[PDB]
Structure 1
Amino acid sequence: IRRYTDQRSLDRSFGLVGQSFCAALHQELREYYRLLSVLHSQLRLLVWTYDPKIRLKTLAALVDHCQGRKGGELASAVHAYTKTGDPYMRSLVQHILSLVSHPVLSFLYRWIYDGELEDTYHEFFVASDPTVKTDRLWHDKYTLRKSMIPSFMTMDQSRKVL
Structure 2
Amino acid sequence: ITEAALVRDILYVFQGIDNIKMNCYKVENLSRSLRDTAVRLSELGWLHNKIRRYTDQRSLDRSFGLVGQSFCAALHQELREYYRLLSVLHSQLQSLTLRRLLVWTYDPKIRLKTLAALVDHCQGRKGGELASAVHAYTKTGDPYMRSLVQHILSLVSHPVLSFLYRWIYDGELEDTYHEFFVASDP
Please indicate the TM-score interval, normalised by the length of the shorter structure. 0.7 to 0.9
Give the distance between the partners of 1:17 and 1:75, measured in 2 at CA.
7
Give the distance between the partners of 2:119 and 2:172, measured in 1 at CA.
31
TM-superposed deviation, 1:26: 0.5
Quote the sequence identity (%): 100
Instruction: Give 1 or 2: higher helix fraction.
Output: 2
Give the number of equivalent residue pairs: 130
TM-superposed deviation, 1:115: 4.7
Give the distance between the partners of 2:167 and 2:179, measured in 1 at CA.
13
Counterpart contact for 1:24–1:95, Cα < 8 Å: no
TM-superposed deviation, 1:61: 0.9
Counterpart contact for 1:119–1:126, Cα < 8 Å: no
Give the distance between the partners of 1:30 and 1:72, measured in 2 at CA.
26
- TM value normalised by structure 1: 0.73
Give the distance between the partners of 1:6 and 1:51, measured in 2 at CA.
25
Give the distance between the partners of 2:54 and 2:80, measured in 1 at CA.
14
Gaps of 5+ in 1: 131-162
Greater shift in the superposed pair: 35-44 or 17-26:
35-44
Counterpart contact for 2:71–2:155, Cα < 8 Å: yes
RMSD: 1.6
Q: 1:51 aligns with which of 94, 97, 107?
A: 107
Greater shift in the superposed pair: 52-61 or 84-93:
84-93
Counterpart contact for 1:8–1:14, Cα < 8 Å: yes
- Structure whose alpha-carbon radius of gyration is higher: 2
Counterpart contact for 1:2–1:29, Cα < 8 Å: no
> Runs of at least 4 residues of structure 1 off by over 4 A?
none
